[PDB]
């Protein structure tokens with residue numbers, strides 16, 4: 001037992017995991033939280049969060065997630081910077097192998113979130129790190145006064161197009177429909193930048209291929225979704241924003257899952273975050289594919305902590 | 317009669333979070349606050365469990381920021397109270413005081429109110445020694461004698477909130493054992509042998525006693541024998557659980573124990589009630605968690621569910 005043991009272990013440093021840590025510490029569970037590769041979650045990659053209830057104006061992504069780390073730290077939550085790459089749920093206490101050490105727990109809260117999907121194109125993979133990216137705030141400054149493309153039609157794609165609008169010379173938003181599924185006030189901000197700014201729309205278009213030489217992306221080829229006709233577009237980079245895939249690869253074969261999402265009990269009779277393995281609970285984007293908000297992930301993280309407490313108290 | 321695409325009943329965490337997300341979706345929400353503006357949180361001194369907030373967060377402080385957040389996105393906040401609804405008609409008609417309302421989609425988040433025993437003497441001494449919220453009336457009984465009726469989470473954790481305020485707390489329960497979280501019974505049981513708590517198991521509050529100035533005692537009755545017993549206390553806290561404020565919905569919405577039934581599940585539309593276009597959020601549909609962060613999460617789902625419904629109308 002060089003393994004680090006604790007009554008409760010929380011995977012993920014996002015809204016779901018940090019909210020679970022607050023409610024777990026206040027229940028005297030002495031929770032241990034594993035942050036992961038991306039400390040703070042997906043919210044640390046956006047600059048505006050105006051739908052966190054209680055913050056009327058001026059809240060940023062990393063600002064809320066630093067406030068949540070302080071909140072969990074203040075209640076003496078052991079925050080460990082590691083990345084779990086292998087788990088074992090056929091033994092109790094559960095065992096999780098990290099890149100630094102190994103951890104053991106009687107109850108586990110899985111809130112590993114989701115990572116950006118990719119189209120899967122051959123040229124898309126070839127130009128990764130050389131023009132193809134999935135985080136506008138990470139690689140946006142590369143393209144100061146240049147033409148960039150953004151593929152997608154959701155909240156992420158519109159925000160990335162609006163963010164790159166203030167850095168790049170032209171932003172070409174590629175979407176396969178003539179309408180977007182982002183928030184309405186984001187569509188209004190998008191359309192204002194289309195009529196008066198440097199955002200060009202390319203509706204009813206799909207990315208057919210990423211083009212470039214040995215020094216990065218020099219353009220993209222689009223395809224008309226109605227006529228099959230192709231056309232070329234000169235850009236220096238391409239940001240893919242076609243959705244997020246839950247981070248559940250290490251749990252495959254040991255948890256019940258559907259389309260990569262961890263299945264939970266749900267329901268109106270409590271124990272809603274319970275997975276197919278008793279004593280293991282899931283919260284956040286790892287088990288939600290319909291809402292996927294910071295406030296919804298935090299609420300589910302609270303349920304997971306309370307469900308974990310009621311499970312621990314049922315043990316002899 | 318006023319009309320709007322979306323109507324939100326309640327001004328708590330669930331109702332205000334629904335108003336924010338609905339305003340961001342160009343729905344122009346109208347929010348009826350109810351008689352209690354801000355919800356149950358406006359009756360709490362400190363809130364240390366709202367994620368992302370530093371120390372010193374007060375109940376009314378968080379709900380003032382929520383109202384300002386909703387008002388900032390142009391949410392029409394109407395101080396009213398609904399007392400009659402008609403869900404068989406479409407658009408739904410809601411009859412309140414000084415106004416009647418109409419809407420194509422409705423989000424119900426009217427919260428829950430604490431139960432009372434229903435005794436005649438309990439009714440008279442309300443606010444004069446008899447109350448449910450131990451926070452709003454906890455400073456009255458510093459170094460005095462108080463009684464707490466109940467045997468669950470609400471009663472045990474309120475008996476602990478008074479264990480360091482009052483000189484002694486009499487916990488009155490009708491069963492031999494309790495029914496709270498195991499760590500709440502542990503915080504309670506050591507304060508029975510080493511602290512301020514005195515147990516009155518297998519007892520029922522028979523009558524609240526006192527004069528025209530306040531509670532001077534309570535009479536307990538043995539649930540086994542029927543013989544009574546008198547106690548001397550300056551206050552009596554009734555903590556027998558909460559009741560979802562859904563009396564005006566009986567008959568028109570599928571309910572269980574007063575709580576509005578929703579679809580739940582993992583395939584979206586989780587807040588959909590038994591009437592398409594009507595959605596529930598917060599303590600009216602949750603009897604397992606009853607948290608502010610949980611209610612705010614459901615209010616967001618109710619707004620996203622209502623937006624999909626209103627969008628499907630064309």
Ligand SMILES: Cc1cc2nc3c(=O)[nH]c(=O)nc-3n(C[C@H](O)[C@H](O)[C@H](O)COP(=O)(O)OP(=O)(O)OC[C@H]3O[C@@H](n4cnc5c(N)ncnc54)[C@H](O)[C@@H]3O)c2cc1C
Nearest residue numbers: 012013014015016036038041084112113284285292293294
């Ligand atoms: C660009 C962008 C902008 C957004 N803006 C908003 C907004 O304004 N408002 C809003 O409500 N929502 C917004 N969202 C959505 C929001 O980010 C999610 O709802 C939320 O971040 C999900 O919370 P979570 O804790 O469930 O997952 P995440 O926040 O993604 O947390 C995942 C955590 O799990 C850890 N992890 C993953 N795998 C492992 C492993 N194998 N081992 C150990 N740890 C691991 C990671 O390190 C990470 O910290 C936005 C999303 C994006 C991408």
Ligand SMILES: Cc1cc2nc3c(=O)[nH]c(=O)nc-3n(C[C@H](O)[C@H](O)[C@H](O)COP(=O)(O)OP(=O)(O)OC[C@H]3O[C@@H](n4cnc5c(N)ncnc54)[C@H](O)[C@@H]3O)c2cc1C
Nearest residue numbers: 326328329330350352355356398426427598599606608611
């Ligand atoms: C004393 C006390 C302390 C608490 N402390 C905490 C804490 O520290 N942390 C925490 O997370 N939770 C706490 N809670 C619980 C928390 O407040 C609730 O879970 C949460 O506020 C409920 O959210 P809600 O918006 O669904 O309902 P509420 O917040 O109760 O809001 C209900 C609203 O609906 C309105 N309404 C009611 N009936 C009608 C009607 N007929 N017509 C129109 N409007 C109506 C009312 O005006 C009210 O504003 C506490 C509760 C109490 C009683």
Ligand SMILES: NC(=O)c1ccc[n+]([C@@H]2O[C@H](COP(=O)([O-])OP(=O)(O)OC[C@H]3O[C@@H](n4cnc5c(N)ncnc54)[C@H](OP(=O)(O)O)[C@@H]3O)[C@@H](O)[C@H]2O)c1
Nearest residue numbers: 051152153154155156157176177181241242243244291292
């Ligand atoms: N400010 C905020 O509140 C905020 C900000 C960001 C994210 N979020 C939330 O976080 C979640 C993340 O959503 P997201 O915007 O990242 O993705 P999403 O909402 O799932 O939408 C992805 C977009 O990409 C398109 N797409 C998907 N697969 C594609 C493919 N193979 N080829 C071409 N186009 C494809 C989809 O078009 P179709 O519509 O045609 O499928 C869709 O419009 C969302 O649920 C959102 O609500 C919220």
Ligand SMILES: NC(=O)c1ccc[n+]([C@@H]2O[C@H](COP(=O)([O-])OP(=O)(O)OC[C@H]3O[C@@H](n4cnc5c(N)ncnc54)[C@H](OP(=O)(O)O)[C@@H]3O)[C@@H](O)[C@H]2O)c1
Nearest residue numbers: 466467468469470471491495555556557558603604605606
């Ligand atoms: N903050 C929260 O709300 C929270 C937090 C964690 C967990 N929970 C869960 O939610 C539940 C909350 O319990 P609660 O105490 O709020 O409500 P509850 O479960 O209904 O318990 C009420 C208690 O009061 C007694 N009681 C009820 N009606 C009575 C009457 N008319 N006269 C005398 N006594 C009466 C009951 O005794 P009997 O046992 O004899 O019925 C019961 O012990 C818990 O079971 C817990 O699992 C809630």
